[PDB]
Design an enzyme around this catalytic site. Structure first.
Site, PDB file in Angstrom:
ATOM      1  N   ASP A 148       0.979  -1.121  -0.198  1.00 18.45           N
ATOM      2  CA  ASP A 148      -0.079  -0.005  -0.152  1.00 18.45           C
ATOM      3  C   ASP A 148       0.777   1.468   0.001  1.00 18.45           C
ATOM      4  O   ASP A 148       0.742   2.182   0.680  1.00 18.45           O
ATOM      5  CB  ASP A 148      -0.364  -0.611   1.375  1.00 18.45           C
ATOM      6  CG  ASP A 148      -1.722   0.863   1.015  1.00 18.45           C
ATOM      7  OD1 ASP A 148      -1.912   1.677  -0.046  1.00 18.45           O
ATOM      8  OD2 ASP A 148      -2.248   1.110   1.913  1.00 18.45           O
ATOM      9  N   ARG A 152       0.276   9.668   0.528  1.00 20.98           N
ATOM     10  CA  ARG A 152      -0.746   9.105   2.193  1.00 20.98           C
ATOM     11  C   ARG A 152      -0.487   8.711   2.940  1.00 20.98           C
ATOM     12  O   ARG A 152      -0.268   8.336   4.530  1.00 20.98           O
ATOM     13  CB  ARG A 152      -2.404   8.766   1.867  1.00 20.98           C
ATOM     14  CG  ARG A 152      -2.650   7.623   1.681  1.00 20.98           C
ATOM     15  CD  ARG A 152      -4.555   7.185   1.163  1.00 20.98           C
ATOM     16  NE  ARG A 152      -4.223   5.960   0.837  1.00 20.98           N
ATOM     17  CZ  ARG A 152      -3.877   4.941  -0.650  1.00 20.98           C
ATOM     18  NH1 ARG A 152      -3.884   6.844  -1.461  1.00 20.98           N
ATOM     19  NH2 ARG A 152      -3.864   4.463  -0.806  1.00 20.98           N
TER      20      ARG A 152
HETATM   21  C1  LIG Z   1      -0.962  20.572  10.501  1.00 20.59           C
HETATM   22  N1  LIG Z   1      -1.057  18.559  11.063  1.00 20.59           N
HETATM   23  C2  LIG Z   1      -1.455  18.354  12.494  1.00 20.59           C
HETATM   24  C3  LIG Z   1      -1.034  17.151  13.605  1.00 20.59           C
HETATM   25  C4  LIG Z   1       0.389  16.891  13.066  1.00 20.59           C
HETATM   26  C5  LIG Z   1       1.134  15.579  13.945  1.00 20.59           C
HETATM   27  O1  LIG Z   1       0.249  14.510  13.094  1.00 20.59           O
HETATM   28  C6  LIG Z   1       0.794  13.768  13.235  1.00 20.59           C
HETATM   29  C7  LIG Z   1      -0.010  12.627  13.443  1.00 20.59           C
HETATM   30  N2  LIG Z   1       0.159  10.830  12.411  1.00 20.59           N
HETATM   31  C8  LIG Z   1       1.578  10.650  13.298  1.00 20.59           C
HETATM   32  C9  LIG Z   1       1.809   9.816  13.299  1.00 20.59           C
HETATM   33  C10 LIG Z   1       3.197   9.311  13.085  1.00 20.59           C
HETATM   34  C11 LIG Z   1       3.426   7.827  13.108  1.00 20.59           C
HETATM   35  C12 LIG Z   1       2.872   7.225  12.601  1.00 20.59           C
HETATM   36  C13 LIG Z   1       1.291   7.145  12.108  1.00 20.59           C
HETATM   37  C14 LIG Z   1       0.130   6.201  11.816  1.00 20.59           C
HETATM   38  N3  LIG Z   1       0.148   6.367   9.847  1.00 20.59           N
HETATM   39  N4  LIG Z   1      -0.360   8.010  10.346  1.00 20.59           N
HETATM   40  C15 LIG Z   1      -0.303   8.276   8.197  1.00 20.59           C
HETATM   41  C16 LIG Z   1      -1.469   8.741   8.473  1.00 20.59           C
HETATM   42  C17 LIG Z   1      -1.667   9.601   9.374  1.00 20.59           C
HETATM   43  C18 LIG Z   1      -3.139  11.419   9.373  1.00 20.59           C
HETATM   44  C19 LIG Z   1      -3.166  11.875   8.112  1.00 20.59           C
HETATM   45  C20 LIG Z   1      -3.189  10.203   7.113  1.00 20.59           C
HETATM   46  C21 LIG Z   1      -4.111  10.621   5.449  1.00 20.59           C
HETATM   47  N5  LIG Z   1      -4.386  11.115   4.893  1.00 20.59           N
HETATM   48  C22 LIG Z   1      -2.000   9.297   6.563  1.00 20.59           C
HETATM   49  C23 LIG Z   1      -0.400   7.292   7.383  1.00 20.59           C
HETATM   50  C24 LIG Z   1       0.879   6.200   7.929  1.00 20.59           C
HETATM   51  C25 LIG Z   1       1.605   5.989   9.506  1.00 20.59           C
HETATM   52  O2  LIG Z   1       1.582   4.764   9.437  1.00 20.59           O
HETATM   53  C26 LIG Z   1       1.128   8.718  12.423  1.00 20.59           C
HETATM   54  N6  LIG Z   1       2.489  11.483  13.674  1.00 20.59           N
HETATM   55  C27 LIG Z   1       2.056  12.727  13.669  1.00 20.59           C
HETATM   56  C28 LIG Z   1       0.855  17.048  11.413  1.00 20.59           C
HETATM   57  C29 LIG Z   1       0.807  18.451  11.050  1.00 20.59           C
END
Ligand SMILES: CN1CCC(COc2cnc(-c3cccc(Cn4nc(-c5cccc(C#N)c5)ccc4=O)c3)nc2)CC1
Length: 289
Positions: A148, A152
């Site tokens: 995948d 994103r």
């Molecule tokens: C403005 N905005 C405010 C918040 C900020 C920080 O937010 C974070 C959000 N998520 C993580 C995180 C870290 C490691 C692993 C994952 C899990 N994972 N998630 C995604 C993912 C997360 C969000 C949207 C989409 C889509 N479409 C995909 C993809 C692959 C995966 O493995 C999440 N870290 C920080 C970013 C900037």
């Protein structure tokens, strides 16, 4: 969790994070997967220095067999490491189960490149692709098939380092628009990123990850446009078989479009390896100011 095989518990112990090492902020969702939301937390290292985490809570576990599988996978995934692949920091069991991942300050790669307040140069965008290629070269060397790969599903940290993510205990549907159910098996398929042979057989390989990587390059060069917007999900297989491919983006350099096209060769064996992709893309990247 006392129903778990005790030898499995001993085998996974080194992946387990105790609750007194964690401070999680469960009042605020920072990301959303179908199978669980993500929260910010901090993990305390041996000095008590804070490590920033994304903590994901898995939401539809119903049997100890699923937990056992999760733990078994965690052992494997814990020992992966590469600067362009997301690490598994650990699993907290004594707190549903929590997957503890590194916090990614700049979020997913698709949202980052669509942010209209930032102007990544063409060079920067190609550099993101190069970083993904290096992470995928690593996964391929571990004989691990992602299945995948898409913009994103890659993340950016505070140094703007790109991490291939969405695999192992982090696998999920983070944007459900792009997944379609296959009747014959119930698999949720990211159809517009899949290789022709995977669409026909539902089998995946490193060479089908190469196909997806070509689509990801197209995403980068369009700053996150959705691929094939006028082709219905159920019509992509035929579209590809007709001898049609994504069109060259306006600001995609010709040598990079050539790379994309090679990634979409109908014969898997004729697609470049990720080693070749790293080499060729590093050359293309190096030619920009
Ligand atoms: C403005 N905005 C405010 C918040 C900020 C920080 O937010 C974070 C959000 N998520 C993580 C995180 C870290 C490691 C692993 C994952 C899990 N994972 N998630 C995604 C993912 C997360 C969000 C949207 C989409 C889509 N479409 C995909 C993809 C692959 C995966 O493995 C999440 N870290 C920080 C970013 C900037």
């Amino acid at each position: 969790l006392s129903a778990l095989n005790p030898e499995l518990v001993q085998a996974v112990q080194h992946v387990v994070i105790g609750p007194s090492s964690l401070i999680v902020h469960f009042n605020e969702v920072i990301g959303r997967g179908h199978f669980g939301c993500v929260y910010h937390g901090t993990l305390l290292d041996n000095d008590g220095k804070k490590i920033h985490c994304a903590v994901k809570s898995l939401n539809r576990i119903t049997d100890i067999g699923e937990v056992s599988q999760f733990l078994t996978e965690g052992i494997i995934m814990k020992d992966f490491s590469h600067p362009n692949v997301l690490s598994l920091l650990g699993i907290c069991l004594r707190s549903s189960p929590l997957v503890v991942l590194p916090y990614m300050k700049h979020g997913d790669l698709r949202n980052f490149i669509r942010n209209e307040t930032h102007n990544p140069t063409v060079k920067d965008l190609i550099g993101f692709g190069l970083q993904v290629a290096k992470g995928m070269k690593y996964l391929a060397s571990k004989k691990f098939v992602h299945r995948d790969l898409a913009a994103r599903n890659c993340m950016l940290d505070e140094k703007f380092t790109v991490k291939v993510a969405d695999f192992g205990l982090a696998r999920d549907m983070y944007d459900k628009e792009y997944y379609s159910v296959h009747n014959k098996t119930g698999a949720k398929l990211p159809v517009k990123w899949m290789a022709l042979e995977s669409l026909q057989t539902q089998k995946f390989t490193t060479k089908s990850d190469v196909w997806s990587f070509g689509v990801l390059l197209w995403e980068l060069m369009t700053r996150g446009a959705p691929p094939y917007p006028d082709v219905n999900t159920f019509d992509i297989t035929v579209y590809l078989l007709q001898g049609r491919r994504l069109l060259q983006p306006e600001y995609c350099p010709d040598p990079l479009y050539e790379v994309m096209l090679k990634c979409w060769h109908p014969k898997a064996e004729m697609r470049p390896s990720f080693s070749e992709l790293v080499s060729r893309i590093s050359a293309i990247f190096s030619t920009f100011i």
